[PDB]
Write a protein that binds this ligand. Structure first.
Ligand SMILES: OC[C@@H]1O[C@@H](O[C@@H]2[C@@H](O)[C@H](O[C@@H]3CO[C@@H](O[C@@H]4CO[C@@H](O)[C@H](O)[C@H]4O)[C@H](O)[C@H]3O)OC[C@H]2O[C@@H]2OC[C@@H](O)[C@H](O)[C@H]2O)[C@H](O)[C@H]1O
Length: 381
């Protein structure tokens, strides 16, 4: 078969699970309203002035590039221009470099007021910023700068591939292997950063010289994720070497294990399958990870070695983990797919100081499983 990119048909797995259409759309809208306009123990979005707003990492009391970029995608996928523009204005103003080795990249986290905490960037932010902006252009049309969406996107993806050619700086993609990097400087990666589905669409909307690269990178990332995921459990490390093996322990933590970052791999893999249907391995990977967690309660979620050895330590984001395991049902045809969809439906949004990452993964799963995580092309509106 052909994917949602070709057919324009999006699977409603909640409907397939037996839930009513009415119910599903109401549940999606409520999730938007709570995360963006809820109470002080739920909402993760905060509007600032008349033309700005941010997504708060409640857990770390800072504003991340990954989070702001997640927020923009959430906004454009839900047809929420006002909120989309507020977020982008915050990112463009406070976070985007206008000079230095990081010119056109984004400072990976800052304070709610906009004061930067580190200058270095996080590539998973950049790619999400780029994809979100192209969808904004395709859905709403380019506004006046800085709301010339497709132009802002192309400028970011130019930097991503070409940052070292203008004197000093490093590219976010390693030219030799066409793989996104953990950060510009270090020659290793993060499985969760690989969005081959997003790169297919960059191959359509990026600067003309780079379109070949993005198409090659789509297939490179699909290949990398086959080497990153354990062939039994379908678990993956947080940081990985280009060969897919867990990276050495870093100075800021041990990232060889299946923890917070790794959760998004199963969701990323599943969305690529839904959109493009290119890699039949993605179905098997969805079956494997679901089968590893088929027997495990959310309250019993741990840190695991990719081999499947549970640490005594609990998962920091078990609702997040359930959401991504549930999102895998987009691609899973196994006997656990139906189970995971119902399990997620009966799981509410997280509350308390650690809620941010859980609720971000929650909302993407709510979008995806309702059939509302869609490609916005140069169509006939
Ligand atoms: O913790 C001290 C910081 O470590 C150094 O590393 C930075 C990375 O952490 C960052 O990757 C970010 C981190 O946030 C990720 O999302 C997480 C998922 O886990 C949840 O619990 C959490 O709420 C959520 O935020 C997100 O996916 C990524 O975007 O990437 C940048 C990296 O930068 C650099 O560290 C390496 C160093 O060489 C550079 O100097 C620095 O810029 C930070 O230095 C330090 O502050």
């Amino acid at each position: 078969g052909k994917g949602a990119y070709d057919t324009g048909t999006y699977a409603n797995l909640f409907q397939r699970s037996g839930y009513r259409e009415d119910e599903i759309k109401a549940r999606l809208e409520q999730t938007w309203n709570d995360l963006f306009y809820g109470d002080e123990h739920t909402r993760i979005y905060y509007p600032v002035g008349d033309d700005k707003g941010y997504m708060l990492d409640t857990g770390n009391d800072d504003v991340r590039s990954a989070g702001m970029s997640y927020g923009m995608m959430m906004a454009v996928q839900m047809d929420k221009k006002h909120e989309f523009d507020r977020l982008w204005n915050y990112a463009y103003t406070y976070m985007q470099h206008t000079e230095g080795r990081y010119k056109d990249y984004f400072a990976w986290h800052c304070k709610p007021d906009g004061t930067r905490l580190s200058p270095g960037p996080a590539p998973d932010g950049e790619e999400f910023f780029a994809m979100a902006l192209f969808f904004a252009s395709n859905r709403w049309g380019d506004g006046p700068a800085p709301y010339d969406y497709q132009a802002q996107a192309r400028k970011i993806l130019h930097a991503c591939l070409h940052q070292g050619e203008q004197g000093e700086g490093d590219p976010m993609w390693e030219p030799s292997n066409r793989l996104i990097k953990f950060i510009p400087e270090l020659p290793f990666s993060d499985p969760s950063y690989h969005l081959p589905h997003f790169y297919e669409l960059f191959a359509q909307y990026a600067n003309e010289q780079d379109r070949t690269f993005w198409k090659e990178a789509a297939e490179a990332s699909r290949a990398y994720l086959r080497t990153a995921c354990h062939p039994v459990t379908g678990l993956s490390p947080e940081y990985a070497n280009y060969d897919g093996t867990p990276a050495p322990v870093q100075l800021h933590g041990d990232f060889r294990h299946f923890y917070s970052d790794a959760y998004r791999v199963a969701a990323n893999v599943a969305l690529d399958w839904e959109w493009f249907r290119k890699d039949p391995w993605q179905v098997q990977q969805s079956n494997r990870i679901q089968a590893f967690f088929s027997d495990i309660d959310v309250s019993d979620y741990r840190r695991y070695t990719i081999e499947g050895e549970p640490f005594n330590e609990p998962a920091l984001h078990p609702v997040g983990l359930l959401a991504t395991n549930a999102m895998a049902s987009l691609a899973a045809d196994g006997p656990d797919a139906d189970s995971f969809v119902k399990r997620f439906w009966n799981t509410p949004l997280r509350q308390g100081k650690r809620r941010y990452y859980d609720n971000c993964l929650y909302f993407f799963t709510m979008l995806a499983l309702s059939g509302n995580y869609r490609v916005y092309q140069q169509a006939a509106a």
